[PDB]
Symmetry: C2
Subunit: 190 residues, 2 copies
């Protein structure tokens, strides 16, 4: 038996990832990332359905119905951000020629998206994301990892980095360049 | 003369802030933060109008019209995320009783929102955000600052921290607790 909070947290955590990937796919014109986004859009509809199922069954009296509505209302805004993400994804899958200012805009905002190469020498090779907490210890958020021909989306704390992995992360420009050097093996301390 | 990129970057940077504040206002039931969000919603419509004005005037031939459309299309998704943020803000301004799982959900997601007290002893007192780059050097994003009776939203790199300021930031739970100790003066190094 899942809780409303459980379901709700995954919705928020998933849509945050979806918006990040929609931008990743636009920047790299990557159709596989774009397709991950639409799969996630489905999971959101499924989570929202379940949130409604729990919510509806839970209101006993008037005051509680009133509250259960504030939840649906928020899940609705999350729902709208999810479809918006899907929209950006479709543009990539459609294969339309993107105006150059789009990729530059994603690389020059307060928070950009960056691609990081991991070298054999890097002090992070062998460390899990959990152990590392780059989000925590570097402000760079790892949203995906291209390990050869495969993609690991929304990797967890168990995921262990290998030389050759290409980290896809979000953070400030400075956060990303820094992290890149830690990955070339230029910076031996994290 | 502004450029399309200029306008576009502010749109993306502003909506990212709006979503962050919509959550801040929900968590603290703060009506002033909520009202900032709606003011920002207006600025987005204004930026989008200008983006359209530039875009429309810029397409010379067919291929270029095609590209200018990919821009409008994205500005449209940004537009939808902005209205979604406004929706969350309205719930706070409406003063409706929020279901308890909402504030817990904002405090228990991958990325939470936190309130940070700055003490006289803190090594950050006297430092500008620019100089500091907490986003960069700590992964905590400062989205607003309650300095007494006033709010500084989306503070820039010039903003200089004072004892007594209450920093509103976004980051992982660990990033936020850490930053809190640097603010109590418990941790003398950043
Ligand atoms: Cs490509
Ligand atoms: Cs959806
Ligand atoms: Cs019921
Ligand atoms: Cs909706
Ligand atoms: Cs809608
Ligand atoms: Cs393309
Ligand atoms: Cs650190
Ligand atoms: Cs995963
Ligand atoms: Cs995850
Ligand atoms: Cs590689
Ligand atoms: Cs309040
Ligand atoms: Cs708007
Ligand atoms: Cs024209
Ligand atoms: Cs729209
Ligand atoms: Cs819409
Ligand atoms: Cs309230
Ligand atoms: Cs650091
Ligand atoms: Cs500002
Ligand atoms: Cs700013
Ligand atoms: Cs204070």
């Amino acid at each position: 038996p899942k809780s409303v909070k459980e379901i709700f947290i995954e919705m928020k955590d998933t849509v945050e990832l979806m918006v990040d990937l929609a931008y990743a796919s636009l920047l790299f014109g990557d159709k596989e990332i774009a397709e991950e986004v639409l799969e996630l859009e489905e999971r959101i509809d499924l989570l929202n359905y379940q949130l409604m199922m729990h919510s509806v069954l839970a209101a006993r009296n008037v005051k509680e119905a009133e509250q259960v509505i504030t939840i649906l209302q928020i899940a609705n805004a999350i729902e709208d951000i999810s479809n918006a993400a899907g929209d950006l994804a479709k543009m990539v899958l459609e294969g339309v020629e993107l105006h150059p200012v789009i990729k530059e805009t994603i690389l020059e905002g307060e928070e950009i998206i960056g691609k990081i190469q991991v070298y054999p020498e890097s002090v992070i090779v062998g460390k899990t994301l959990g152990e590392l907490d780059l989000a925590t210890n570097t402000g760079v958020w790892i949203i995906a990892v291209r390990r050869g021909k495969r993609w690991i989306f929304g990797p967890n704390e168990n995921f262990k980095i290998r030389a050759g992995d290409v980290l896809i992360g979000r953070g400030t420009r400075t956060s990303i360049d820094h992290l890149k050097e830690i990955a070339r093996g230029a910076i031996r301390v994290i």
